[PDB]
Amino acid sequence: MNPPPPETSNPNKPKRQTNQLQYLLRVVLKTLWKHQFAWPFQQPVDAVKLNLPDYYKIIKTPMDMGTIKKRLENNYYWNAQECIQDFNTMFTNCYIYNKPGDDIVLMAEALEKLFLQKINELPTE
Numbered sequence: 001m002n003p004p005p006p007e008t009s010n011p012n013k014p015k016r017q018t019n020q021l022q023y024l025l026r027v028v029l030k031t032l033w034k035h036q037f038a039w040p041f042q043q044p045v046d047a048v049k050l051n052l053p054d055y056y057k058i059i060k061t062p063m064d065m066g067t068i069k070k071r072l073e074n075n076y077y078w079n080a081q082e083c084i085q086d087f088n089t090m091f092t093n094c095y096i097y098n099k100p101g102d103d104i105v106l107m108a109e110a111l112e113k114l115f116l117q118k119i120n121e122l123p124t125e
């Protein structure tokens with residue numbers, strides 16, 4: 001069964017627009033989004049549709065690039081590191097729920113390498 005997806009708006013949360021967060025949306029997120037391995041990560045895992053009744057019994061901090069994109073577009077984040085943590089959470093969830101050599105893990109590994117390549121250098125403030 002599906003829990004509520006992670007929030008993408010929160011009026012009491014303090015927000016900030018930074019050059020680095022703009023970069024995370026304009027180039028980092030949008031480049032990863034077009035990768036041929038991006039499709040499993042563009043939306044919250046639907047455990048009912050995907051027939052994974054144990055997904056959310058295992059994964060307790062779900063995250064996906066669709067949620068990250070909406071957070072960025074809604075200026076949800078305070079700084080780039082908060083956004084980077086969401087990316088890292090998404091990748092780690094994939095490695096936790098699956099196992100080495102799974103097709104989904106191969107995809108996450110390729111995306112994670114591209115992700116780190118893109119954030120290795122960020123713009124300044």
Ligand SMILES: CC(=O)Nc1ccc(-c2c(-c3nc4ccc(N5CCN(C)CC5)cc4[nH]3)[nH]c(C)c2C(C)=O)cc1
Nearest residue numbers: 039040041042043045050051052093094095097098104
């Ligand atoms: C038997 C088998 O392979 N089970 C299975 C089921 C689910 C997943 C799986 C998926 C996933 N599976 C999708 C199937 C469809 C879509 N679509 C919506 C996007 N749209 C362009 C195309 C359709 C998105 C998807 N994300 N994501 C993650 C993070 C997964 C895991 C387990 O970590 C991996 C394997």
